Write a protein that binds this ligand. Sequence first.
Ligand SMILES: CCCCCCCC/C=C\CCCCCCCC(=O)O[C@@H](COC(=O)CCCCCCCCCCCCCCC)COP(=O)([O-])OCC[N+](C)(C)C
Ligand SMILES: N[C@@H](CCC(=O)O)C(=O)O
Lengths: 46, 49, 51
Amino acid sequence: SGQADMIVAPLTINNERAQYIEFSKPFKYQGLTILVKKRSTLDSFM
Amino acid sequence: ELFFRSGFGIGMRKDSPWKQNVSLSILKSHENGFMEDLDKTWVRYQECD
Amino acid sequence: GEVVMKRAYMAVGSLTINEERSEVVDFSVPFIETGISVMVSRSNGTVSPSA
Ligand SMILES: CCCCCCCC/C=C\CCCCCCCC(=O)O[C@@H](COC(=O)CCCCCCCCCCCCCCC)COP(=O)([O-])OCC[N+](C)(C)C
Ligand SMILES: N[C@@H](CCC(=O)O)C(=O)O
């Protein structure tokens, strides 16, 4: 829309976005990952 | 395991008179170790694990 | 050198994008991430000095 002249952000290079804007060479190589929720249980000597 | 291994880029418009020199200044900063400086100071902290 | 001298229009292979090449040839988006890594024969491995 002309509001911004550059997007300096973690913008993922995609086929969808590449049809409209010019991505640079990646400054960070990465991928998609799944984040999930994370000692000793010796009750006693018996 | 990692999937959809697409990186992060700088977005500019189709014309983008800066498109070529931005990419050349990003490959240069990988080789110079500048991006390893940024990874050290912003990404590699390792508080607890 | 083949693409630079117009002997070929493409250089599909294991070419790594870098500074000097991008000033004479027009690379595409990477299809696999590489870099520089060090391969060392494993040192077997031992127990900690304070086990
Ligand atoms: C390495 C082996 C070689 C050496 C072997 C030596 C031979 C041993 C000789 C003899 C043992 C004779 C049988 C008595 C032992 C208790 C059994 C019992 O039912 O206790 C119950 C109550 O116990 C407790 O919860 C308290 C035990 C710890 C605190 C100490 C209080 C005094 C108990 C001892 C008084 C001294 C008696 C002295 C006269 C005999 C067990 O409670 P629980 O909740 O069911 O526990 C399950 C375990 N869990 C919690 C891990 C899941
Ligand atoms: N693949 C590298 C050469 C191999 C290397 O030296 O790591 C290149 O295209 O120049």
